[PDB]
Amino acid sequence: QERRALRLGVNGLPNSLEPVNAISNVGPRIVNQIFDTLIARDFFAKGAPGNAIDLVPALAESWERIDEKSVRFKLRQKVMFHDGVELTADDVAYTFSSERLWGPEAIKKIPLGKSYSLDFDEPVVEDKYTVTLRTKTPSYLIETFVASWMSRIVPKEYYKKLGAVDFGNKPVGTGPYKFVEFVAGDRVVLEANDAYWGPKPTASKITYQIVAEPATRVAGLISGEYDIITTLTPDDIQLINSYPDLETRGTLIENFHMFTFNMNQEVFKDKKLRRALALAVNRPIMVEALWKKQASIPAGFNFPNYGETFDPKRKAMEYNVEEAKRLVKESGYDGTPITYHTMGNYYANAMPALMMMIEMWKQIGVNVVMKTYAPGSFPPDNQTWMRNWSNGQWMTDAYATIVPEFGPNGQVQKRWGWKAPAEFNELCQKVTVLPNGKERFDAYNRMRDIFEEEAPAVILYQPYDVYAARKDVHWKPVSFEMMEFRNNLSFG
């Protein structure tokens, strides 16, 4: 009798298991198993229900902040990567290097590495088990960055030999499960790493099988094909819970769903029609109709996980149908249909939400039409106008995701053409280097106000992430877009 193999029915798969390129709603549930970070979040600290904020040692046994721009890490000794190579400071230095991650040479290998990274200087290797991470300018975000999904540790020699692309198809990490196979757009299979330095894996094997249609995914749990299924909606809860051997398990996660624009298109170069579309979205009626009250509507680009830079005083985002109609008229919009691209229901409630917004927009005089696209076939940028997206809020600080995504160095401005006000970009630079205080707090509030004025994206809500599982598979969700199995997976 060997350990049970775990069968997962998932909404989607990443195109690469290179851990930075796998950042998405579907990559972390896999790369969290293959790799470790220096510091890890313990969502279950002191009995919490999967939402604790505590950081604990992981690949680093201890660490110390030296000054405003450096942190020294002492590494756990005798940790082995899946191919046997011992983890050393040289691997950590390479993970956070100019070459691999944030320098100009990393642009083709990890396209978002520089824009999502801090203003890093080269790491300093002090000895085989001691490494210092540094920024060129002050950064009080080194610790939260190192605990995050940007900071999974890769093996220097193996990664350099294969290159980022081939490493992404045959990954080697220090994590509790090791790579077996990756069939693009179909499945990922991992196996127990019984040499793991931490809590030993409890499943013999893990299979991530794509089941893009949620109804088929629910039928596969009912029939006994899957142990756990992902990305359901609250409308599936009553049916699943009627089965005595199945149950749903859900939690609000530190992510928001949104829609955004290709601002290289003429109709979206100016803010007026973006604002008109934002002002016509009735979020509470969408939360009632599609989420059974379980989703949460934030007061702007502002979330409690930001800690000292969360503002609980902020007003709700605006809803004004009559001001929206007047903006449609002033924009010169001529009635032509505007497309909105969606990858089916990769996002829970994506197509039901869009159908509701299409009617809301018809009532303001804007004609929007759904265009679907297949997994791994994202349209050419110049064929897209509106599209859905999401952002995981990956730091204990407001820096992420407004600055990495929407800042002067980010993709919304550089790729998608948002001509941000100069004041917004000046504030992004200030919050990057400032320590917490009134100046920094007020700068984030001004950035949030400009974001709502400009509408380069429209925040909808934080999703209630719904899984379903067999009652004999013990596993709790966490408040983030990943699955955790360390000390959180057992059978019987």
Ligand SMILES: *O[C@@H]1[C@@H](O)[C@@H](O[C@]2(CO)O[C@H](CO)[C@@H](O)[C@@H]2O)O[C@H](CO)[C@H]1O
């Ligand atoms: O939020 C998703 C984005 O991260 C991105 O995701 C994938 C995941 O591997 O990343 C590549 C591009 O880096 C993309 O082709 C894959 O789907 O895009 C999707 C689709 O827009 C986002 O939903």
